[PDB]
Amino acid sequence: EILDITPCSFGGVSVITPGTNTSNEVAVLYQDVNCTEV
């Protein structure tokens, strides 16, 4: 049978940041991945 191959899903990692001058609680952005994969 014929199996499709896909390279491992991956992407860049980005950081939300209000700024140290305001707070330090931040939020992460994962690029171009379905969330169900972390």
Binding site: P7, G11, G12, Q31, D32
Partner: peptide, 21 residues
């Protein structure tokens, strides 16, 4: 009218359904 290996493709910030506004 207009038509893998670490090469990411970032989406544009503005979406057409905004540009069309």
């Amino acid at each position: 009218k207009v038509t893998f290996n670490g090469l990411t493709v970032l989406p544009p910030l503005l979406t057409d359904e905004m540009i069309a506004q």
